[PDB]
Amino acid sequence: MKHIDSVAPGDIRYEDLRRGENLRFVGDPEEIHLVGSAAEIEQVLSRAVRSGKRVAVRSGGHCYEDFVANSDVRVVMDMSRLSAVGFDEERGAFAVEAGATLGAVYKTLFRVWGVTLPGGACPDVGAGGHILGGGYGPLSRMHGSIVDYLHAVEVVVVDASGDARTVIATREPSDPNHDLWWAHTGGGGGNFGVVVRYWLRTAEADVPPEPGRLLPRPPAEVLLNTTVWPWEGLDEAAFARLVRNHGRWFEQNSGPDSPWCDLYSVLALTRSQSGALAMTTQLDATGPDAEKRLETYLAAVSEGVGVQPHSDTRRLPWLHSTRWPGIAGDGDMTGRAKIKAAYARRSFDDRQIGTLYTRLTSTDYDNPAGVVALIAYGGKVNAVPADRTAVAQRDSILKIVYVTTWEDPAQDPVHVRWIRELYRDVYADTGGVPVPGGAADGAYVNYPDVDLADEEWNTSGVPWSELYYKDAYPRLQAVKARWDPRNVFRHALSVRVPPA
């Protein structure tokens, strides 16, 4: 509620709060403000704009790029005190403050009301960045994107005069700020203003005003499988057969009407140095033939592969399953990572598979931790028209995430080069990047990668903005001109109006 002292170099908290969770980026802000309300954010924004000081907001700190911690940022607004999660009877919707972590969101919504939101897997990700970016995760095939439930958004914006004010923008089409609401359904963090809180509830018409009916219900229990194929004895033809099995399966079973909307999985194509390839799968356990359906899927992936996978399955209550590291991730954010990603509308072709194999088995590189992970997608995501939100990829079947991780900062160039070359080579037919509307559908802004705007790495002539946003981009630039005319909110991949 009340304002408190900001954090400056010298403070015991400075080394923590000058960073997000991505340790590659160490900020030099002069002041970090632990804001407590919309009114305080307005005060912080006005003084900063009067004095010419560059601002950035930190919510959960999960940014894969240096949007918040880059050296030009002088004033951070840290949303840590604004972490409430609750049901706002005033609006008939669930309020999620920007500083709320996904783990607090899922615990509170489910323990208290028996509902959930289909966002990310990672418990520590913050609502602030995640929802704005088009968050998704294990329940997306079943329930769509988290932005599919965005009813309203409270956001502190800066007018042309440099005054800051707070506005509510709603899903109501007659709402005078409806455009700014739209831009929060995937327009991405750091662009338009400071989100204070989001309100979430089903669009559905025919619903009693009871919180327990206003958001999706998760499956009560799920089956959770780990499958591991050892690399020693996995030849190129074995690798390729497993990839192509998996792609075909997702090609045929990711429609919005598929009975497989209740499955989610991540196939990890690891460096052969790791000694094993792995897959994690989750299926709704509450229907009749659940055990069998899981086995059918696993059988499809390993069909004719010629390597016997070690397989184990456990069954867990839903909220418990969310924190199993097989789905949540291993919680270690203390290394250095570089992430790239793409939408896939169809699975890898024979050429891309060959590149994958070469690159993952290569002895030119030394790092067991590089991975290309194929994340189950589509399903109910794809029920939504591509222009209804600012998430324009509504017919994809997988997200593909290329990652490499290491320790020593002296080694940055070597790991960064490995991953740029792998990604370029996989997307070689199309300028080194996943051009929208073909085999791929561009890229996902919650996995930002500044190389998509680098002309050395992107040779497709398709700019970064179209990779992320497709035809959403002109409408996001209209919102930008309207609500952030001074371009107060910006970073290496921020929405920007046309040249004057």
Binding residues vs Mg ion (CB under 5 A): 124, 323, 332, 405
SS3 content of the chain, % helix, strand, coil (to 5): 30, 20, 45
Please report whether residue 403 would count as binding ligand TIR according to CB under 6 A: yes
Binding flag, residue 150, ligand FAD (CB under 6 A): no
By beta-carbon proximity to a second copy, the closer residue of 10 and 498 is 10
Count of residues interacting with ligand FAD (CB under 6 A): 35
Q: Is residue 360 part of the contact set for ligand TIR (CB under 6 A)?
A: no
- The SS3 assignment for 197 reads strand
The region of 189-197, 233-241, 348-356, 470-478 touching ligand FAD under the rule CB under 6 A is 189-197
Which of 67, 110, 343, 483 binds ligand FAD (CB under 6 A)? It is: 67
Indicate the DSSP class of residue 407: S
Which listed option, ligand FAD, a second copy, Cl ion, none, makes contact with residue 132 (CB within 5 to 8 Å by class)?
ligand FAD
The candidate with the shortest Cα–Cα distance to 243, out of 357, 369, 345, 138, is: 357
Q: Checking phi first, is residue 125 left (phi over 0); if not, alpha (psi -120 to 50) or beta?
A: beta
What burial letters (b/e) apply to 427-453, b meaning 16+ CB within 10 Å? beeeebbbbbeebbbbbbbbbbbebbb
For the record, the structure tokens of 62 come out as 């999960």
If one asks whether residue 447 binds a second copy (CB under 8 A), the answer comes out as no
Task: Note whether 136 binds ligand FAD by CB under 6 A.
Answer: yes
Site string for ligand FAD, 457-496 (x = CB under 6 A): ----------------------------------x-----
> How far, in Å, CA of 486 to CA of 386, rounded?
29
Note whether 103 binds ligand TIR by CB under 6 A: no
495 labeled part of a ligand binding site:
no
Residue 327 interacts with which of a second copy, Mg ion, ligand FAD, none, CB < 5 to 8 Å by class: none
User: Which residue in the block uniquely carries the two structure tokens 């002069």?
Assistant: 30
User: Which amino acid, one-letter code, is at 236?
Assistant: E
Contacted by 317, from ligand TIR, ligand FAD, a second copy, none: CB < 5 to 8 Å by type: a second copy
Which one of residues 17, 45, 121, 267 is an interface residue with ligand TIR (CB under 6 A)? 121
266 binds ligand TIR (CB under 6 A): yes
Residues contacting residue 274 through CB under 8 Å, at least 6 positions apart:
231, 368, 369
User: How far is 440 from 399, CA to CA, in rounded Å?
Assistant: 10
279 binds ligand TIR (CB under 6 A): no
b/e map of 395-418 (b: 16 or more CB within 10 Å)? ebbbbbbbbbbbeeeeeeeebbeb
Q: Which of 121, 157, 356, 476 binds ligand FAD (CB under 6 A)?
A: 121
Distance between CA atoms of 468 and 465, rounded to whole angstroms? 5
Is there binding between residue 122 and Cl ion (CB under 5 A)?
yes
Residue pair 227/309 in contact by the 8 Å Cβ criterion: yes
DSSP H or E segment with residue 132: helix 127-132
Nearer to Mg ion, 323 or 346 (CB): 323
Smallest gap from Cβ 147 to ligand FAD, in A, equals 10
* One of 27, 135, 432, 434 touching ligand FAD (CB under 6 A): 135
Residue 111: exposure state from Cβ atoms within 10 A (0-12, 13-18, ≥19): exposed
Residues in the chain: 500
Told to check if 405 binds ligand TIR by CB under 6 A, we report yes
Q: Residues forming the annotated binding site?
A: 57, 59-63, 121-122, 124, 126, 129-130, 136, 195, 444, 446
Q: Residues forming the annotated binding site for FAD?
A: 57, 59-63, 121-122, 126, 129-130, 136, 195, 444, 446
